[PDB]
Design a protein around this ligand. Structure first.
Ligand SMILES: Nc1ncnc2c1ncn2[C@@H]1O[C@H](COP(=O)(O)O)[C@@H](O)[C@H]1O
Ligand SMILES: Nc1ncnc2c1ncn2[C@@H]1O[C@H](COP(=O)(O)O)[C@@H](O)[C@H]1O
Ligand code: NA
Ligand code: NA
Lengths: 137, 137
C-alpha cells in the first residue's frame, strides 16, 4: 505494498543506480532512464522496475516515462542543464510535486529552488557536513 | 585572528582543495599534503598556507606536518586505508581530538567511528539527503 510509490530516475550512473536499487528493494515502482543502455548494468540482480533508453534532453523521452503518474522524479544525470530541463518539465508539464535534482554548480542552485525543485549539490553537501563537525548543527 | 586554528589536510584533490581554499580564506593556518605536487594547482591565488609533498601512508610524512599542534586533521585522500592510517595516527600518536576522514566504503565507517574519527561517506551522505527530501528530517 500500500506504501508503494511511482518513482522516475533519470541517469543510471553511480548516484542514480544507488537510488534505483534502494527504491526497488523498498517496494516502489521504479522507471530508470539513461541515454546509454550499458549504464543499466549498475542495477542489481534484485532490481524490479523498468528501463528506458533515451536522451532526457528530448521531450519525447520524458513522455515515455508516465511522469504524470509519478510521485517523485529524480533528475540525476551528470549535466546541470539536462537536469534543469527534466525538473522543469516534471514540475510544470507533468505536475509532479516532489522533484529532486543533482546540481554540480552551486551558482545554479537558486534557479532550481525558485521553481520548487529540491537540490543535491555535492560540493555544498560536503562543506555543510564539514561545518557540522566543526561548529555543530 | 584570535579565532585562527591549525588545520592539516591530507589530499589536495577535488574535496581537499575545496576545504583548504575555504579554510585559508577563513583565516586559519593550513598545511595541505599530497603525494602529487601537481595537485596543488587546485589551491587558489589567495591561498595562504603551506604545502607538503609526501606519501601520507608513510609515518615520516605525518611527522613533517606538526600534527601535534593541529586543532583539526582532515584525511581526504582517495584511499580508505590511507585515510585510516592518517586518522589513527592523528588521534593516538599526535593526540588530535578533531579528526575527520573520507570513507568511500560504508562498511568501513564503523572502525573509524569506534576510534573517535568523524566520517564523510559520499554514498551515505547522498542517501541521507534523498531520505530527508522524502520522509523529512
Ligand atoms: N541527456 C541524458 N539523458 C539520459 N541520461 C544521461 C544524459 N546525460 C547523461 N546521462 C547519464 O547520466 C549518468 C551520469 O552518471 P554518474 O556521473 O555516474 O552519476 C550516466 O549513466 C549518463 O549516461
Ligand atoms: N598516499 C597518499 N598520500 C598523499 N596524497 C594522496 C595519497 N593517495 C592519494 N592522494 C591524493 O588524494 C587526492 C584525491 O583526489 P580527489 O579524488 O580529487 O579528492 C589526490 O590529489 C591524490 O594524489
Ligand atoms: Na519560475
Ligand atoms: Na580502538
Amino acid at each position: 505494498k500500500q506504501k508503494s510509490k511511482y518513482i522516475v530516475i533519470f541517469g543510471c550512473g553511480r548516484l542514480g543506480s544507488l537510488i534505483a536499487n534502494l527504491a526497488s528493494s523498498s517496494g516502489h515502482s521504479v522507471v530508470v532512464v539513461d541515454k546509454n543502455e550499458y549504464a543499466f548494468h549498475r542495477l542489481n540482480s534484485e532490481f524490479s522496475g523498468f528501463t528506458v533508453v533515451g536522451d532526457a534532453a528530448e521531450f519525447e523521452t520524458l513522455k515515455e516515462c508516465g511522469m504524470e503518474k509519478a510521485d517523485m522524479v529524480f533528475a540525476f544525470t551528470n549535466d546541470d542543464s539536462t537536469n534543469f530541463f527534466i525538473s522543469m518539465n516534471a514540475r510544470y508539464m507533468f505536475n509532479v510535486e516532489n522533484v529532486i535534482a543533482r546540481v554540480y554548480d552551486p551558482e545554479k542552485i537558486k534557479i532550481f529552488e525558485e521553481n520548487g525543485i529540491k537540490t543535491i549539490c555535492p560540493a555544498v553537501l560536503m562543506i555543510e557536513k564539514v561545518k557540522e563537525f566543526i561548529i555543530g548543527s
